[PDB]
Design a protein around this nucleic acid. Structure first.
Ligand SMILES: [Zn+2]
Ligand SMILES: [Zn+2]
Ligand SMILES: [Zn+2]
Lengths: 71, 47, 76, 1117, 55, 115, 66
RNA sequence: GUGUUUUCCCCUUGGC
């Protein structure tokens, strides 16, 4: 009942949600479920990468730029 | 009246786990959870 | 003995302000397990003062402390 | 264009691209991936259909494997924390066809029947972590730097150590002195992944008419003479024989040498009496002659030389192969060919996690087939149609692998003591260089306590394969070994494409040969099967090489060896051949030209890769047996330039010579400036240096972990420790070392540390100890539960303070705990006995985190880990990268340490006497270049063989910063401020802090716990034991004549005890001292009793004698 | 709940220098001050209260 | 774990004396001053100030064990001069030295400013 | 792990220079000119910043919550 | 006023 009205994939374990979506896509021989899974997975990937950069947004960005320019 | 609060390993949600109870997060159902820090006096010297 | 197993602060002498738990105590000296160092000192029991670690209230269910702005039905 | 020197940059753009393509544990991952992708299916595929009153046929197909799942996908960190086995279910398609009377068969296919869980190696092609990004791995609480390559068994990281062995299918001629045999042509044979183990053959020659050649066929007790064996293969004539053994009769010498073996056999001509001969030597000889023939016929068909073939191949192809075994024996006897060295690494193979597991799966499978066979028998044969889905005892695979990967007993639990041991060791998480080196570790099965030096010696053939420096200095010295950085263990590939290709190119197949052709013709040996001969081996070698350089028909791992002197081309494709890449040399130019370097510099941006260097015929995997035949330059600018030529015929060039070093040895700077045992000692201690061992250490509940507060990147590094990822997970601190005698507390291999530096956090570390305890239904009335004991009800209850832990029965994070404090309160009902767990005696730390969960049984399970900040103290063992090691001998505050003109006091003062006997001049050069690096403001290079670096060049740089060019400085005595008359060598050197802290070692006893059997002190610190006053101490006190102190040590301070003995006999009497009444039963005397002060172990010995019916009658007379 | 354990935090706080250019000559050593806890005549109290409620 | 607490280098224990003169017997007019909870900081300046005294035949200081916080200062003077007063004057004048140095430093500070 | 607060050898506060160090490197100061510009003269202070590996940035990749 | 207890074998690793 709790998971009914409360979404999970935005949880910190987004990698696990992506693994579950990949498993659901692979388990299905129907192209409609595969395309819905692909869309959901791409959306969750974009959301998680955005959040990762946002937390990476400051100081993490700075040390990434320094390592990449240093090499 | 202390219900023994635990912290879900995945959700980081607090969970009340009294005796004779299965360990599951009531949010995720995840089976690993960690005790919260003590309430006693933690004092260090900074030595 | 009456002051064994309690969290105590050393209030006097060189260890002033160290916090530890009395692992043992005679009438003359406690042994205090120091919180910071990996060491148990023997300390003259008059140097110690009990701090304790407790929580008041004990009633988690309905301490509403009024409330959190109850929304009306005819306001929407 | 060619690389015009300036080649160091290019040389490390290669290598860098290699370690991009093939991270350090590739040899584990590939082995496992190949096992799961081929070998597992191969084993189930090649197991025969099972059949039996009607009889079914039962057959298996298309084995399937899912992702690892808990029943939902288990993450490896979950399996680690919950003590699960990280594993995936293995499913197979089973077709059952029962057929019976009336011709009524139903082939009902049981799809995807669950055979069992197979444990998955982490970061494999079948781990959940495969190809998974660093973001996701961190989200999984995994470490993106963690290599993988280990299993999780019940929560323990278990590595499969690669086990060295003699190469199969390859003939070897040895002389075994102290035997009747002058020479012995051994062979160890396997056709392919057989459930039958390797079958070993010997064709020995008796040394003593003299010179008789025997054969030690398997399953034969005696030793049939070889000519009987060839006649058993059906060759009547003495010229059809010998045509297999002497390829030109024009040699009189082998002819007249083999003659006396024919004179041993000329009584036998027909094949049938030959088989009667062999059958009569069978280990289970049949009564009737015909059964003896059939037994011997099978042995030759199936047990001798199986790799060459079975059934139809028996009477020719492996007659030729046995002929070759004899021929090479004769060569070894004439001395025309040297004996094979058993320790030449081309003669060895390494059983990685693939073959190691394939062996078990052939052992646990087939067992399952036996199980389903017995089941369907019991049922079907009673006309009871079985279900196979109940027949499949999935426990057989799942627990067989789980067990063997846990214990490491590589065999059935029924027979583990007969098996190999320690094949599967708990991954060394102590420090990242230890994890990386444990994963790259090889192990000779040769017996330790085997006194032989030759298997422990560093053989010439380990060059570039195995670290010359990283070996345990203990009893395993030279037996346990380590892969070199670029060493790759070949995973194995099918020879069939190569055999099809060799059927082209005018090759002549062995069964179509006219044997006269063999005389002047090179013999071809695919995986040690002799498969044909060729008239022109200068074309084959160039074509097979070209094809390797084109990656098409022959995969890179294949090694073609051309023995010139003996006309033999041997091609190996099988698995376990250690190899390493080499730059190819052609004419005298390298093929690696500026094009490749430029393309590879922009790699990822152009998605070029090392695989393009391989697939451009630019670099080549050479393996130790092909390394026999390369001519190997060591750098281009050194060795191929037009000096007065050394050879000018180099085929290959070393990529960089430091790649002979392994993981822990290639963290040594300037190892070419150290005495070699000291590089070995560093390779040892480098596996103990505290660091950060993995970045997810906050999630690990490892039993022991040491984490350094402020681990630093070395101020001087090898380039190799880039790829070791040492600058990300470093283990040590660059400290301003001074090599001065100073106050003498650093004298014999000791160091003076700066107390004020320690106060600032110098080498301060934290020690995490994790205690794990779970629940259980012990019985009907007995049950454990996490609960604060209370003196009211809990009957058993220690003297401890149980109130430190809260009513959950679990100590909470952040609570100070000391030895014999209660950590997990636990009661077991009888009312309740106390069964709790206490912090190890004198541990004294803080609870770091407490986790609670359910184990496989679904019982509450908790792991508590307690941290312990370890401020360096006197007796803590420090070491440096150069095998200098020493306990902190004293700590002087900054005011007391000597100081330069500026107030730079050393951090560590080490005694000069550490250096001159040990010649760790790499240590001095590290200190000098570290002082340059710290002033220059960038990290010096200490890659060993880099002639761009030398001491004079460093001194020149150091003099530019206003320091003495040799690193010496005027120091001032901290106590008096006077200048020290000798200027002191002082500078930054990378020190390590080792796990050997003194508080983990200090131990004392004064009447502690006692053993139950012999009432002597328990053994060991953890037990609060007493030190052993051993034999040698007994001798040392006899020499002292210290009989009173010998009596006290060996009695009054160990097992003081008393017996009453009868005066008339010397059997111990019965003595109710409680009523002061005494008797000896057997004499019925009550006055004739005397007390004897008597060591308890002596009393116990005499009672162990009486229980053998020996009366040690002790007499006072 | 930082990634550093408490002794590490405490240690780092120890090493932070404080501008005691004058007050050090006023304050007693705590070992010598006659009061049961810390007091402003033998100590300076510090508070740190930080939570990372942002990305 | 069986570590001395760091205050043991300078805090006297209850009953420890700071300084404890002991007449030496081997030669006339020689004493051994045993300072507790002192080190080369206080012992070396006293030693070197005693060597400026012409009436001091011998002066030296040792730290018997660095793990122990105790120095011994042995002073021998001429028979017209007890080492008690040698040690006293070696401290009186050394205090006069440090106090003069302090005053001269304090003035030199405010004289570097605008000078 | 994190930058040491004080240079172990001498005592100079280096715990307020790491982010400055990296920012100067991002201005593409050469690696010793960053140290010369922060004010680290003694090689004992310079090896605090040169040698420091800032692992806390990796430890912060792991989530407690969110 | 009630108070010191309490496992083993086997393997592996490591220390001088
Ligand atoms: Zn008797
Ligand atoms: Zn006060
Ligand atoms: Zn410094």
């Amino acid at each position: 009942e709790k998971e009914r009205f409360r979404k999970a994939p935005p949880n910190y374990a987004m990698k696990k949600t992506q693994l579950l979506k990949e498993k659901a896509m692979a388990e299905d021989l129907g192209d409609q479920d595969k395309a819905k899974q692909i869309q959901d997975q791409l959306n969750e990937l974009e959301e998680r990468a955005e959040a990762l950069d946002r937390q990476r947004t400051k100081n993490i960005s700075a040390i990434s730029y320094i390592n990449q320019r240093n090499r | 009246q202390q219900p023994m609060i635990y912290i879900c390993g995945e959700c980081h949600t607090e969970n009340e786990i009294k005796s004779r109870d299965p360990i599951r997060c009531r949010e995720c159902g995840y089976r690993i959870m960690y005790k919260k820090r003590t309430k006693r006096l933690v004092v260090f010297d900074a030595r | 003995n009456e002051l064994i197993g309690q969290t105590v602060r050393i209030s006097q002498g060189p260890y002033k302000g160290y916090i530890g738990v009395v692992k043992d105590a005679t009438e003359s000296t406690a042994r205090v397990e120091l919180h910071s160092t990996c060491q148990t000192i023997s300390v003259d029991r008059q140097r110690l003062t009990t701090v304790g670690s407790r929580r008041p209230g004990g009633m988690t269910s309905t301490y509403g402390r009024y409330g959190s702005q109850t929304p009306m039905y005819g306001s929407g | 264009e060619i690389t015009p020197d300036l080649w160091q940059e290019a040389c490390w753009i290669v290598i860098s691209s290699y370690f991009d393509e093939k991270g350090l544990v590739r040899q584990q991952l590939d082995s496992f991936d190949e096992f799961i992708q081929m070998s597992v299916q191969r084993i189930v595929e090649d197991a025969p259909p099972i059949d039996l009153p009607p009889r079914y046929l039962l057959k298996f197909e298309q084995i399937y494997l899912s992702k690892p799942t808990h029943w939902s996908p288990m993450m490896p960190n979950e399996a680690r924390l919950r003590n699960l086995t990280y594993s995936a279910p293995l499913y197979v398609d089973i077709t059952k066809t029962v057929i019976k009377e009336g011709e009524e068969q139903l082939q009902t296919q049981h799809q995807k029947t669950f055979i069992g869980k197979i444990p998955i190696m982490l970061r494999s092609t079948y781990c959940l972590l495969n190809g998974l990004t660093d973001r996701d791995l961190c989200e999984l609480n995994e470490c993106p730097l963690d290599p993988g390559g280990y299993f999780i068994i019940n929560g323990s990281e278990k590595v499969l150590i690669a086990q060295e062995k003699m190469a199969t299918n390859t003939v070897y001629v040895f002389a075994k002195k102290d035997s009747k045999y002058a020479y012995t042509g051994e062979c160890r044979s396997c056709l392919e992944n057989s459930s039958r183990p390797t079958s070993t053959i010997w064709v020995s020659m008796l040394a003593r008419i003299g010179q008789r050649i025997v054969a030690t066929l398997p399953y034969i007790k005696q030793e049939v003479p070889i000519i009987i064996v060839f006649r058993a293969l059906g060759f009547v004539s003495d010229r059809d024989i010998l045509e297999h053994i002497i390829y030109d009769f024009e040699d009189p010498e082998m002819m007249e040498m083999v003659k006396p073996s024919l004179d041993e056999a000329f009584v036998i001509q027909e094949q049938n009496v030959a088989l009667n001969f062999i059958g009569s030597r069978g280990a289970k000889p049949g009564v009737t002659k015909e059964k003896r023939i059939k037994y011997a016929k099978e042995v030759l068909q199936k047990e001798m030389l199986p790799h060459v073939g079975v059934s139809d191949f028996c009477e020719t192809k492996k007659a030729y192969f046995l002929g070759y075994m004899v021929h090479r024996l004769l060569l070894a006897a004439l001395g025309r060919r040297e004996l094979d060295d058993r320790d030449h690494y081309g003669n060895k193979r390494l059983d990685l996690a693939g073959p190691l597991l394939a062996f078990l799966f052939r052992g646990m499978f087939k067992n399952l087939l036996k199980e389903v066979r017995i089941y369907a028998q019991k049922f079907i044969d009673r006309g009871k149609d079985f279900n196979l889905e109940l027949a499949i005892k999935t426990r057989i695979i799942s627990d067989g692998l789980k067990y063997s990967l846990a214990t490491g007993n590589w065999g059935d639990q029924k027979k583990a003591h007969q098996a190999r041991a320690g094949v599967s060791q708990v991954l060394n998480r102590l420090t990242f260089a230890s994890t990386l080196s444990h994963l790259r570790r090889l192990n000779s099965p040769i017996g330790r306590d085997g006194k032989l030096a030759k298997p422990r010696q560093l053989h010439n053939t380990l060059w570039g394969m195995v670290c010359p420096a990283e070996t345990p200095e203990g009893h395993a010295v030279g037996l346990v070994k380590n892969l070199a950085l670029m060493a790759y263990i070949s995973v194995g590939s099918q020879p069939s494409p190569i055999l099809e290709f060799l059927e082209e190119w005018s090759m002549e197949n062995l069964e179509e040969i006219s044997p006269a052709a063999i005389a002047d013709a090179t013999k071809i040996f695919v995986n040690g099967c002799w498969v044909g001969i060729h008239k022109d081996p200068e074309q084959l070698m160039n074509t097979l090489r070209k094809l390797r350089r084109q990656m098409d028909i022959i995969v890179s791992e294949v090694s073609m060896i051309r023995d010139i002197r003996e006309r033999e081309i041997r091609i190996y494709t099988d698995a376990g051949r250690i190899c390493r890449p080499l730059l190819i040399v052609e004419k005298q130019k390298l093929l690696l030209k500026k094009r490749h370097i430029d393309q590879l510099k922009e790699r990822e941006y152009n998605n070029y890769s090392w695989q393009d260097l391989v697939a451009s015929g630019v670099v080549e995997y050479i393996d130790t047996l092909e390394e026999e035949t390369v001519m190997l330059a060591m750098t281009p600018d050194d060795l191929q330039e037009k000096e007065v030529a050394y050879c000018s015929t180099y085929t290959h060039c070393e990529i960089h010579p430091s790649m002979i070093l392994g993981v822990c040895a290639s963290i040594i700077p300037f190892p070419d400036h150290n005495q070699s045992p000291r590089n070995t000692y560093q390779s040892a201690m480098g596996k103990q240096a505290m660091g950060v061992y993995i970045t997810n250490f906050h999630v690990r509940m490892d039993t022991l972990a040491h984490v350094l507060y402020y681990p630093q990147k070395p101020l001087v590094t090898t380039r190799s420790m880039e790829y070791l990822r040492f600058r990300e997970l470093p283990a040590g601190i660059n400290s301003i070392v001074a090599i001065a005698s100073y106050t003498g507390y650093n004298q014999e291999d000791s160091v003076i540390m700066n107390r004020s530096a320690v106060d600032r956090g110098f080498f301060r570390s934290v020690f995490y100890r994790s205690y794990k305890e779970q629940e259980s239904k012990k019985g009907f009335d007995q049950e454990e539960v996490f609960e604060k004991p209370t003196r009211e009800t809990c009957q058993g209850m220690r003297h401890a303070i149980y109130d430190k832990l809260d009513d959950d029965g679990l100590i909470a994070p952040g609570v100070r705990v000391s030895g014999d404090d209660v950590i997990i309160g636990k009661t077991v009902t009888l009312t309740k006995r106390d069964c709790s767990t206490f912090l190890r005696t004198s541990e004294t730390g803080i609870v770091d985190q407490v986790m609670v969960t359910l184990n496989q049984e679904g019982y509450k399970f908790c792991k508590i880990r307690v941290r312990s900040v370890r401020i360096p103290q006197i007796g803590d063992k420090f070491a440096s990268r150069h095998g200098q090691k020493g306990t902190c001998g004293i700590q002087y505050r900054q005011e007391d340490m000597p100081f330069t003109c500026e107030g730079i006091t050393p951090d560590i003062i080490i005694n000069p006497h550490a250096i001159p006997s040990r010649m760790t001049i790499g240590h001095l050069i590290e200190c000098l270049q570290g002082k340059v690096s710290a002033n220059k403001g960038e990290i010096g290079d200490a890659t060993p063989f880099n002639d761009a670096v030398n001491v004079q060049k460093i001194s020149n740089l150091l003099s530019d910063y206003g320091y003495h060019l040799r690193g010496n400085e005027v120091l001032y005595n901290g106590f008096t401020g006077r200048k020290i008359t000798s200027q002191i060598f002082i500078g930054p050197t990378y020190y390590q802090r080792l796990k050997h802290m003194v508080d983990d070692k200090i131990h004392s006893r004064a009447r502690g716990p006692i053993q139950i059997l012999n009432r002597q002190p328990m053994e060991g610190r953890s037990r609060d034991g007493g030190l052993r006053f051993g034999e040698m101490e007994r001798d040392c006190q006899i020499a002292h004549g210290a009989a009173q102190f010998l009596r006290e040590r060996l009695f009054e301070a160990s097992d003081p005890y008393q017996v009453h003995v009868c005066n008339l006999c010397g059997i111990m009497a019965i003595a109710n001292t409680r009523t002061h009444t005494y008797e000896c039963r057997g004499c019925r005397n009550k006055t004739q009793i005397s007390l004897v002060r008597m060591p308890y172990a002596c009393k116990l010995l005499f009672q162990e004698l009486m229980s053998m019916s020996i009366a040690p009658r002790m007499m006072s007379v | 709940s930082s990634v550093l354990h408490d002794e590490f935090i405490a240690h780092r706080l120890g090493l932070i220098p404080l501008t005691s250019d004058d007050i050090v000559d006023k304050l007693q050593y705590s070992r010598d001050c006659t009061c049961e806890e810390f007091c402003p005549e033998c100590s300076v109290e510090f508070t740190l209260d930080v939570r990372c409620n942002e990305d | 774990m069986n570590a001395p607490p760091a205050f043991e280098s300078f805090l006297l224990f209850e009953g420890e004396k700071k300084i404890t003169i002991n007449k030496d017997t081997k030669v006339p007019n020689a004493c051994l001053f045993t300072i507790n909870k002192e080190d080369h900081t206080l012992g070396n300046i006293i030693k070197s100030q005693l060597l400026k005294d012409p009436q001091v035949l011998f002066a030296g200081y040792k730290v018997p064990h660095p793990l122990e916080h105790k120095i011994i200062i042995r002073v021998q003077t001429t028979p017209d001069y007890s080492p008690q007063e040698a040690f006293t004057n070696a401290i009186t004048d050394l205090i006069s030295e440090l106090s003069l140095l302090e005053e001269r430093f304090r003035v030199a500070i405010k004289d570097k400013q605008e000078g | 792990m994190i930058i040491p607060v004080r240079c172990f050898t001498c005592g100079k506060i280096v715990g307020n220079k790491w982010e400055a160090y990296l920012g100067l490197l991002q201005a593409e100061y050469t690696e010793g000119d960053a140290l010369d510009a922060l004010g680290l003269k003694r090689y004992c202070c310079r090896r605090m910043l040169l040698a420091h590996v800032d692992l806390i940035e990796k430890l912060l990749n792991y989530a407690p919550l969110e």
